[PDB]
Structures are given as C-alpha cells and as structure tokens.
Amino acid sequence: GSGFPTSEDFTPKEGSPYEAPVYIPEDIPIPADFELRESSIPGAGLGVWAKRKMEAGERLGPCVVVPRAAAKETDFGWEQILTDVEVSPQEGCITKISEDLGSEKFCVDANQAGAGSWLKYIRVACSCDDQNLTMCQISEQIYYKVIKDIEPGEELLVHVKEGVYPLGTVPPGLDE
C-alpha cells in the first residue's frame, strides 16, 4: 500500500509509490521578500507572506513573462489580450541577453528567483477593511500590483473576481 511501509510478502514497490508530505519536493523558487507556506487563514486561505515591507507603488513578480502569442487559454481578466499581431521587429525589440541582478550594480532582488506559480496563491482579503489587492496586466504578462505599503505579516494580492475573471474588475463589454 502506497503511503505507508507495508512490508507484507514479496510485493515489489513498483510505479514509484510516493506521497507528498507537508514539505513538498517541488520547492518552487520564490523572491526572498516573500515566504510561501501552507497557512490556512480563515477568510482567505493560503498566501505568500511578505517577510519584508513594501511602500506604495510596489509590484509582485515575476509571475509570467509570457508574450502575446504565447498561447493563452481564453480569458484571465479581459477577453483576449492577443489582439495584436506579435511581429516583433528585429530592429529594436530583440533582447537576446538578460540583465542579471548580481553583484555588479544591482541592489535589487528581482528577475532572480521566482517560477511564477507562487503568485497564484494570494487570494481575496478576509476583510473588506483590508482591501489592498489589485491585478496588473502589462505587456500581456501577469503581475500583482499593490495599492499601498505592505507590512510584514499580511498578504493581500488578488485578481478581483465575482464570477471567473472578467466582470470582477474589467468591463465584460470591453471595446464595445
């Protein structure tokens, strides 16, 4: 039986009988400014707690760096952001290199660690007095934009939704 050391007869433990404990072997890379942990807070659920503070104008990332023609499902809070031919002229927008935030002149902890799935954990604020959550959609990629300063110990960042995605914060009749 998978999940427990059975030790009954000469039954080969085939097929990789593995089960995920409290600490998952995935271990998704996250920015050091935020901690990912299972902590069910009544009214929200699980989220990534900022162990550090932020001041108004901050944005959580990276989530996804997926361009226009990167095969989007259908809608994530608009209708279809792939409404522009991504020709991408090779006379300007190329970026074959990547600026690394290392020990040169980069006292910024960004574009280093962060698969992106870490940002889908943050949910709607437990209380309407704690509303400080807004979704940002730029360059056809997803970011969580914070409203005002964050104090270490509260994660309120979500795409406001009252159905699935669209009518939550965007007009369901965009561009008429």
Curated annotation (Swiss-Prot):
What's the stated role of this polypeptide?
Binds DNA and functions as a transcriptional regulator. Displays histone methyltransferase activity and monomethylates 'Lys-9' of histone H3 (H3K9me1) in vitro. Probably catalyzes the monomethylation of free histone H3 in the cytoplasm which is then transported to the nucleus and incorporated into nucleosomes where SUV39H methyltransferases use it as a substrate to catalyze histone H3 'Lys-9' trimethylation. Likely to be one of the primary histone methyltransferases along with MECOM/PRDM3 that direct cytoplasmic H3K9me1 methylation.
Q: Which residues form the SET domain?
A: 32-161
Share what the entry says about its subunit structure, partners included.
Interacts with CEBPA, CEBPB and CEBPD; the interaction is direct. Interacts with PPARG and PPARA; controls brown adipocytes differentiation. Interacts with CTBP1 and CTBP2; represses the expression of WAT-specific genes. Interacts with PPARGC1A and PPARGC1B; interaction with PPARGC1A or PPARGC1B activates the transcription of BAT-specific gene. Interacts with HDAC1, SKI, SMAD2 and SMAD3; the interaction with SKI promotes the recruitment of SMAD3-HDAC1 complex on the promoter of TGF-beta target genes.
Q: Could you identify this protein by its name?
A: Histone-lysine N-methyltransferase PRDM16
**Reported tissue expression:** Expressed in uterus and kidney. Expressed in both cardiomyocytes and interstitial cells.
**Localization in the cell:** Nucleus; Cytoplasm
The superkingdom of the source organism is: Eukaryota
The disease this record links to the protein is: Left ventricular non-compaction 8: A form of left ventricular non-compaction, a cardiomyopathy due to myocardial morphogenesis arrest and characterized by a hypertrophic left ventricle, a severely thickened 2-layered myocardium, numerous prominent trabeculations, deep intertrabecular recesses, and poor systolic function. Clinical manifestations are variable. Some affected individuals experience no symptoms at all, others develop heart failure. In some cases, left ventricular non-compaction is associated with other congenital heart anomalies. LVNC8 is an autosomal dominant condition. Cardiomyopathy, dilated, 1LL: A disorder characterized by ventricular dilation and impaired systolic function, resulting in congestive heart failure and arrhythmia. Patients are at risk of premature death.
Q: Which family does it belong to?
A: Belongs to the PRDM16 family.
